[PDB]
Design a binder for these strands. Structure first.
Ligand code: NA
Ligand code: NA
Ligand code: NA
Length: 326
DNA sequence: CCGACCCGCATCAGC
DNA sequence: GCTGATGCGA
DNA sequence: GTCGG
């Protein structure tokens, strides 16, 4: 029920997960999600599939499943997937970070189906999957904004202790003011790092955060992207905080604010802004805004030294992150 | 009728 | 050893 | 799965 249509939204999200994890049909997965997002925003209790079909992203098949769900309170197809041992095991194992549909299938094919089975077969797991297994429960917890604020202060301070010239921004829905987050997404830059130009810039920051024991584990790390695990320090007497997922991305200074814009979102806000930028003769991606010639040929990137600059180019009043829900 | 639907890093396949 | 494909994660 | 060239 939720905000009028949670049963339908829950059903669509479950169908999405089966498409992604078991059938390996990622476009169907995203079709079901989009339909769930549209419906979640529809401010009426839907009464028929035909009503739902009017909404963009709902077609004949989702309408039919909505009719069945309304008439009966259930979907047959979803009921049989639920009791299928292979589908439910594949679905479950993909909850481990680093285990996607392919690894989940091979594990289930070899009788590895549960966390206990994984705990028993560690040598069959790569490094990422072992870390995802170790923190299985913590990684499914949301992060309250209160903790994200603290996490933000540590990153910004540690970054400044390495080099005062680093610029670091915590983006994601947290930057839009969200009351919880699923992970922490940090965008980093330094004036010595441009698209046309000093080494170890990402490494130095990751190392600092490891030294003070904020970053506890590494999932992947190269010269421009780090994915890992972090944890707030304990009060010495209170319960330990859960381990959290954190990504850090090093971006060229001249592309920084286009990245900050992109990764702050929302996704709906980004599609809308790109769509408006096109109808003004501009193309914006996660790195640049460039003017379009009369035949549609993208010209050279325009200078960008703030988020505002981007809004100025396309004749749009600046909108605070708080106001970028769409 | 039928193709679109948006890359960094770890690891495998193959050479 | 290397190059390119694949899986994965957001 | 849904949309649209
Ligand atoms: Na529709
Ligand atoms: Na997974
Ligand atoms: Na998953």
């Amino acid at each position: 029920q939720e905000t009028l249509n949670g049963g339908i939204t829950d059903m669509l999200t479950e169908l999405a997960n089966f498409e992604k994890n078991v059938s390996q049909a990622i476009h169907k997965y995203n079709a079901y999600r989009k339909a769930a997002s549209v419906i979640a925003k529809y401010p009426h209790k839907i009464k028929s599939g035909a009503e739902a079909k009017k909404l963009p992203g709902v077609g004949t098949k989702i309408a039919e499943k909505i009719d069945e769900f309304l008439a009966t309170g259930k979907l047959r197809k979803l009921e049989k997937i639920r009791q299928d041992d292979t589908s439910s095991s594949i679905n479950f194992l993909t909850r481990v970070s680093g285990i996607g549909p392919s690894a989940a299938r091979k594990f289930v094919d070899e009788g590895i189906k549960t966390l206990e089975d994984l705990r028993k077969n560690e040598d069959k797991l790569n490094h990422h999957q072992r870390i995802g297994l170790k923190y299985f429960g913590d990684f499914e917890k949301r992060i309250p904004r209160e903790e994200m604020l603290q996490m933000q202060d540590i990153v910004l301070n540690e970054v400044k202790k390495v080099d005062s010239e680093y610029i670091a921004t915590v983006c994601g829905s947290f930057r839009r003011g969200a009351e919880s987050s699923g992970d922490m997404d940090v965008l980093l830059t330094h004036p010595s790092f441009t698209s046309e130009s000093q080494p170890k810039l990402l490494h130095q920051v990751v190392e600092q955060l490891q030294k003070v024991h904020f970053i506890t584990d590494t999932l992947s790390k190269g010269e421009t992207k780090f994915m890992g695990v972090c944890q707030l320090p304990s009060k010495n007497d209170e319960k330990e905080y859960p381990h959290r997922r954190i990504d850090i991305r090093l971006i060229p200074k001249d592309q920084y604010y286009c990245g900050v814009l992109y990764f702050t979102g929302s996704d709906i806000f980004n599609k809308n802004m790109r769509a408006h930028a096109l109808e003004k003769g501009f193309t914006i991606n996660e790195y640049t805004i460039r003017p379009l010639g009369v035949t549609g040929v993208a010209g050279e990137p325009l200078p960008v030294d703030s988020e505002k600059d981007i809004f100025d180019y396309i004749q749009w009043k600046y909108r605070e992150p708080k106001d970028r829900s769409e």
